């Protein structure tokens, strides 16, 4: 598509420039282009992809919540519904872009465990965002697709990674939130979060200098979620 005629290395460089300029839509478009060159992403490039699309969908989700609760705080006049649906449709557009990228280019049988788990976690996360706004039969297929992406990522992370690996923890954190807030399974959420926090505690010894800042931070969010939920 539109980035087809640009050099992969120029797309990465322009993504980093869009990041400095806080232009996250631009940054996402650049990383999509880099991904469509068909070469695997480095750790740093994965992180550019995640940052770009988290910021774009993060603003859409926050906007959707504002309008959603204005639509309830008076529940007529169709303006609030209509604008709420409009932001909803854009949000679904971005999720679908990211799910398309993961399916067409990024999710493979090959590669390191980090990369495999990272893409499958992203898949669960982006189905979960669709779940936050879906209803009916749609919602049920969406929840099932999120569960299955998360569960597969969980199976790899337990077989191939240490329990304080940040990607492993972050995965288990997001999955626990899915249980609690989307699947309405709060006991499952609570046990996964606790089991996870504990197994990580039992090995905080075997923790990397660079990983420590992140792994401890995420163990902290598990504690904060468990407090919110008990």
């Amino acid at each position: 598509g539109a980035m087809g005629s640009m050099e992969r290395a120029s797309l990465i460089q322009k993504a980093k420039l869009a990041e400095q300029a806080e232009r996250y839509e631009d940054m996402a478009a650049f990383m999509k282009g880099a991904v469509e060159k068909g070469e695997e992403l480095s750790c740093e490039e994965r992180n550019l992809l995640s940052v770009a699309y988290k910021n774009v969908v993060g603003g859409q989700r926050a906007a959707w919540r504002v309008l959603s609760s204005i639509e309830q705080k008076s529940n007529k006049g169709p303006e609030v519904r209509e604008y709420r649906e409009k932001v909803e449709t854009e949000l679904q557009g971005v999720c679908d872009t990211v799910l398309g990228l993961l399916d067409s280019h990024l999710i493979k049988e090959a590669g390191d465990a980090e990369s495999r788990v990272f893409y499958l976690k992203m898949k669960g996360d982006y189905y979960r965002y669709l779940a936050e706004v879906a209803t009916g039969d749609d919602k049920k297929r969406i929840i099932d697709s999120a569960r299955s992406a998360y569960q597969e990522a969980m199976d790899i992370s337990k077989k191939e990674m240490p329990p304080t690996n940040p990607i492993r923890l972050g995965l288990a954190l997001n999955f626990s939130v899915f249980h609690y807030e989307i699947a309405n399974s709060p006991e499952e959420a609570i046990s996964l979060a606790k089991t996870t926090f504990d197994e990580a505690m039992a090995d905080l010894h075997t923790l990397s200098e660079d990983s420590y800042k992140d792994s401890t931070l995420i163990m902290q969010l598990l504690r904060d979620n468990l407090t919110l939920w008990t």
Binding site: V51, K54, D125, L173, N174, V177, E181, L228
Partner: peptide
């Protein structure tokens, strides 16, 4: 208001 990672 559950926290997820990565944070924004």
């Amino acid at each position: 208001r559950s926290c997820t990672w990565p944070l924004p």
